[PDB]
Amino acid sequence: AFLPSAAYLTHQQKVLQLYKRALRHLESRCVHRDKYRYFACLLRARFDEHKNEKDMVKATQLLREAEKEFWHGQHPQPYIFPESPGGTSYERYECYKVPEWCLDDWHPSEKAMYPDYFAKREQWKKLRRESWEREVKQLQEETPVGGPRTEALPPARKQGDLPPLWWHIVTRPRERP
Partner 1 sequence: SFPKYEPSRLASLPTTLDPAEYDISSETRKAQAERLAIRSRLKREYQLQYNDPSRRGVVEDPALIRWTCARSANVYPNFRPNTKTSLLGALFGIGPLIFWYYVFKTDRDRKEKLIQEGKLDRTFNISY
Partner 2 sequence: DAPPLTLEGIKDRVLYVLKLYDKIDPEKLSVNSHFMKDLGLDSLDQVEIIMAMEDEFGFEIPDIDAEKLMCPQEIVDYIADKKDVYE
Partner 3 sequence: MLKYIIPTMMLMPLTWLSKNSMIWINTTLHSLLISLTSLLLLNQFGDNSLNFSLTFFSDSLSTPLLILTMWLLPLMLMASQHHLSKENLARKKLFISMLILLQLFLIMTFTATELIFFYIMFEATLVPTLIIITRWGNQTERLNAGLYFLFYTLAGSLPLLVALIYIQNTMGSLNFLILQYWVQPMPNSWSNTFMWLACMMAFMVKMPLYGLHLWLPKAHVEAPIAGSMVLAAILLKLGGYGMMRITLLLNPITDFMAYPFIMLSLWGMIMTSSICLRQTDLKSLIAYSSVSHMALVIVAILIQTPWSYMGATALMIAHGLTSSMLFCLANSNYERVHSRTMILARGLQTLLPLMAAWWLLASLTNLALPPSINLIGELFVVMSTFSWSNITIILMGLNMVITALYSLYMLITTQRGKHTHHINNILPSFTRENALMSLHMLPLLLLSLNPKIILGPLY
Nearer to partner 3 among residue 6 and residue 103 (C-beta): 103
Residue 174 binding partner per list partner 3, partner 1, partner 2, none, with a CB distance cut-off of 5 to 8 Å that depends on partner kind: partner 2
Minimum distance of partner 3 from residue 153's CB (angstroms): 17
Q: In degrees to the nearest 10, what's the CA dihedral of 125, 129, 131, 136?
A: 140
List residues near partner 1 by CB under 8 A: 1, 7-8, 14, 18, 56, 60, 63-64, 67-69, 71-72, 125, 128-129, 132, 136, 139, 143, 146-151, 165-168
Among 34, 48, 49, 105, binds partner 3 (CB under 8 A): 105
Alpha carbon distances (Å) from 50 to 45, 65, 86, 99: 9, 13, 33, 50
Longest dimension (CA), the chain: 73
Q: How far apart are CA 78 and CA 21, in angstroms?
A: 10
Single-letter amino acid code for the residue at 160: G
Residue from 41, 98, 112, 127 touching partner 3 (CB under 8 A): that is: 98
* Shortest distance (Å) from residue 5 CB to partner 2: 8
Q: Are 83 and 90 in contact (CB under 8 A)?
A: yes
Q: Which is nearer to partner 2, 24 or 128 (CB)?
A: 24
x/- binding map, residues 77-96, to partner 3, per CB under 8 A?
--------------x--xxx
CA distances from 168 to 5, 16, 69 (A): 20, 32, 43
Please give the residue ranges that form the binding site for partner 3 (CB under 8 A).
91, 94-99, 101-102, 105, 168
